């Protein structure tokens, strides 16, 4: 639409378990704060999955927290043009009618 | 990193760095036969997970 | 940069050339202007500047000035001839934000068109800590810093920051672009088990007693931090003697007998077999 | 004659003063990009036993 500039933007919502998800909401099963909010990234290793599984005790509270992020993308617009010139004598005395 | 240490003679197989030294990976390539296992369901109303 | 314009009355040809340059054709000097305009860089081209300069001068003699009815305002007959160096433009720009994890290589590429050959590239890095300023990347340690493409291997948490590339023309004209790097860090997976490498079995078997064996240890979960290793001397010291310095273990076989050694980091233990042959 | 300049990238339009700036400089589609759920293969194999 007009009167809005030259840019369009959108939001992309990153899933929970990707490595793009970077935040400080994480709390591990021990209850201590940890750097990564997502439990494990896009890692297929069995060791990380086993170590970072969300385990819940019989009487548990404030054990596992997760967080989310979003990403924005943009695009722009441009303008092009060109022209040409002629004289009346050229079209008037030319042998070929209908040159234009 | 479960595999043996990978030197410069690597012909192009995937490696992962463990304790500052590269090591080869291992891949499952699994076969599951009939009636090998079952799922225990607790208050699940006949489904695997609730 | 400042450009200089010369006008030839007879042929109606206007020449745009650098400040230092000069022409002996017989033209006169009309004025000067900045090709990249300070306030409106992408708004006006050379044609508008030349027209604005020519509006001031007189029709009879381009040496002197005149009012409206007596200027040079017909731009259809006037031809513009360009002799100055083409302006420096950024064909390819660095991505604004790059996200990656620890231990992966990242690459930045920039392409610059125009200017006066040759072109020189310099890369700079600003730390993420407060009160930090741009500092040059050591080209000696990283040869790619001089060239257009910059490559970093096995980035860490300290590699996060802002990277800027500076392109310098032969005349000193400078164009630049900036990018930001975000590095995600995870907690160590914790030690599950420890393994022995050359060798899990029999170590190195040498008949000579003076020969010493070399042992290296590792923790299977990738990225796990292994603590300081300690050994437990076990029953047959007469058969062999084991001494550990840091991670590596040195075993000297006094006698030709099989021995087992257990090495621990305080939580996990490794059972390594020692075989000695006379 | 771009007295509009480009409000984004730090340039100022001519009508706007040094202090003020354009209220709106882009368009937002309000339609988000989302990814589908990963598919499962080992789950249909399992047979459930009541506890």
Q: Which two tokens stand for residue B26?
A: 């291992």
Helices (H), chain C: 46-56
Q: How far is the alpha carbon of A5 from chain D, nearest alpha carbon, in Å?
A: 5
Nearest to A35 among C185, C189, C220 (CB): C185
Resolution in A: 3.4
* DSSP track, chain D: --SS--TGGG---SSS-SS---S--SEE----B--PPPP-SSGGG--EEE-
Q: Which two tokens stand for residue A55?
A: 């385990």
- After which residues is chain D discontinuous, taking C to N > 2.5 Å? none
Record: contact B18-C219, CB cut-off 8 A = yes
Between chain B and chain D, the number of residue pairs with CB atoms below 8 A apart is 27
Q: What's the maximum distance between 2 C-alpha atoms anywhere in chain D?
A: 79
Q: For chain A, count helices (H), then strands (E).
A: 2, 2
Rounded distance between C-alpha atoms, residue C193 and residue C195, angstroms = 7
Chain A touched by C73 (CB under 8 Å) = no
Contacting partners of chain C (3+ CB pairs under 8 A): A, B, D
Placement of tokens 């890095």 in the chain: C125
Instruction: Name which of C179, C160, C175 is nearest C101 in CA terms.
Output: C160
Contacting partners of chain B (3+ CB pairs under 8 A): C, D
What percentage of chain A's residues is helix, strand, coil (to nearest 5)?
Answer: 10, 15, 70
Nearest to A12 among D7, D26, D32 (CB): D32
Record: contact C218-B4, CB cut-off 8 A = no
Residues of chain D with Cβ-Cβ distance to B48 below 8 Å are 43, 46, 48
Record: contact C186-A41, CB cut-off 8 A = yes
Q: Which two tokens stand for residue C3?
A: 């450009």
Partner residues linked to C220 by β-bridges: none
Instruction: Name which of C91, C95, C141, C77 is nearest C119 in CA terms.
Output: C91
Q: Which residues of C96-125 are buried (b: 16+ CB within 10 A; e: fewer)?
A: eeebbbeeeebebebebeebeeebebbbbb
Instruction: Name which of A4, A3, C96, A68 is nearest D28 in CA terms.
Output: A4
Q: What's the maximum distance between 2 C-alpha atoms anywhere in chain C?
A: 116
Are C239 and C258 in contact by the 8 Å Cβ rule? The answer is yes
Record: contact B48-D45, CB cut-off 8 A = no
Residues of chain C with Cβ-Cβ distance to B21 below 8 Å are 218
Record: contact A7-D25, CB cut-off 8 A = yes
Question: Measured between alpha carbons, how far is residue C224 from residues A34, C159, C211 in Å?
Answer: 16, 21, 32
Q: Which C residues 48-77 touch D at CB under 8 Å?
A: 48
- Mutate which of D40, D44, D45, D48 to disrupt the B interface (most B C-beta within 10 Å)? D48
- Mutate which of A51, A67, A69, A85 to disrupt the C interface (most C C-beta within 10 Å)? A51
The secondary structure of C129-192, three-state, reads: CCCCCCEECCCCCCHHHCCCCEEECCCCHHHCEEEEEEEECCCCCEEEEEEEEEEECCCCCCCC
Residues of chain D with Cβ-Cβ distance to C48 below 8 Å are 1
Record: contact A19-C189, CB cut-off 8 A = no
Q: How far is the alpha carbon of C239 from chain B, nearest alpha carbon, in Å?
A: 29
Are C192 and C220 in contact by the 8 Å Cβ rule? The answer is yes
Q: What's the maximum distance between 2 C-alpha atoms anywhere in chain B?
A: 56
Q: How far is the alpha carbon of C47 from chain D, nearest alpha carbon, in Å?
A: 12
Rounded distance between C-alpha atoms, residue C253 and residue C241, angstroms = 6
Q: Pick the residue from chain B with its C-alpha nearest to C191.
A: B19
* Phi–psi pair at C68, nearest 5 degrees: -60, -55
Nearest to D33 among A3, A10, A74 (CB): A10
Q: Which two tokens stand for residue C42?
A: 């992408």
Instruction: Name which of C276, C264, C275, C172 is nearest C226 in CA terms.
Output: C264
Chain A touched by C77 (CB under 8 Å) = no
Record: contact C103-B17, CB cut-off 8 A = yes
Instruction: Name which of C255, C258, C256, C253 is nearest C243 in CA terms.
Output: C253
Chain B touched by D35 (CB under 8 Å) = no
Record: contact B37-D48, CB cut-off 8 A = no
Nearest to B1 among C103, C222, C226 (CB): C222
- Mutate which of C183, C187, C191 to disrupt the A interface (most A C-beta within 10 Å)? C187
Rounded distance between C-alpha atoms, residue C1 and residue C46, angstroms = 12
Chain D touched by A44 (CB under 8 Å) = no
Strands of the sheet with C174-184, listed across from one edge = C97-101, C174-184, C161-168, C120-127, C135-136
């Amino acid at each position: 639409p007009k009167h809005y500039g030259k840019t369009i933007k959108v939001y992309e919502y990153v899933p929970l378990l990707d490595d793009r998800n970077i935040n400080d909401q994480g709390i591990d099963a021990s209850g201590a704060t940890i750097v990564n909010g997502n439990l494990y990234g896009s890692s297929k290793d069995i060791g990380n999955i086993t170590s970072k599984l969300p385990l819940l005790t019989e009487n548990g509270g404030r054990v596992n927290r997760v967080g989310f992020t979003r990403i924005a993308r943009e695009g722009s617009i441009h303008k092009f043009g060109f022209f040409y010139e002629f004289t009346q004598e050229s079209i008037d005395f030319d042998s070929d009618d209908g040159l234009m | 990193g479960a595999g043996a240490q990978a030197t410069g003679a690597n012909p192009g197989y995937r490696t992962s760095m463990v304790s500052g030294q590269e090591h080869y990976d291992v891949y499952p390539m699994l076969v599951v036969g009939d009636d090998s296992f079952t799922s225990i369901g607790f208050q699940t109303d006949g489904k695997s997970l609730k | 940069p400042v450009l200089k314009v010369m006008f030839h009355k007879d042929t109606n040809v206007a020449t745009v050339l650098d400040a230092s340059g000069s022409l002996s054709d017989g033209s006169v000097e009309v004025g000067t202007f900045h090709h990249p305009d300070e306030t409106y860089p992408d708004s006006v081209t050379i044609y508008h500047g030349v027209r604005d300069l020519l509006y001031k001068r007189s029709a009879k003699d381009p040496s002197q000035t005149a009012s409206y009815p007596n200027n040079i305002i017909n731009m259809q007959v006037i031809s513009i001839d360009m002799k100055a160096t083409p302006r420096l433009i950024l064909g390819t720009a660095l991505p604004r934000v790059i996200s990656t994890i620890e231990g992966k290589d990242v690459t930045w590429h920039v392409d610059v068109a125009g200017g006066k050959a040759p072109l020189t590239y310099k890369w700079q890095f600003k730390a993420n800590t407060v009160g930090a300023a741009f500092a040059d990347i050591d080209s000696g340690e990283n040869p790619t810093a001089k060239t257009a493409t910059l490559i970093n291997h096995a980035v860490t948490a300290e590699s996060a920051g802002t990277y800027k590339v500076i392109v310098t023309d032969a005349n000193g004209t400078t164009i630049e672009s900036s990018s930001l790097l975000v590095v995600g860090v995870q907690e160590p997976p914790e030690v599950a088990s420890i393994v022995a490498y050359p060798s899990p079995l029999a170590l190195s078997v040498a008949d000579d007693i003076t020969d010493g064996k070399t042992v290296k240890f590792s923790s299977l979960p990738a990225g796990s931090l292994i603590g300081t290793l300690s050994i437990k001397t076990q029953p047959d010291s007469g058969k062999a003697t084991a001494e550990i310095s840091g991670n590596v273990l040195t075993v000297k076989p006094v006698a030709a007998g099989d021995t087992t050694v257990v090495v621990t980091n305080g939580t996990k233990e490794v059972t390594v077999t020692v075989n000695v042959t006379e | 004659m771009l007295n509009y300049n480009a409000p984004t990238d730090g340039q100022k339009s001519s009508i706007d003063g040094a202090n003020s700036d354009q209220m709106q400089t882009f368009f937002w589609l309000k339609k988000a990009i989302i990814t589908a759920r990963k598919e499962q293969y080992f789950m249909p194999l399992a047979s459930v036993t009541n506890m």
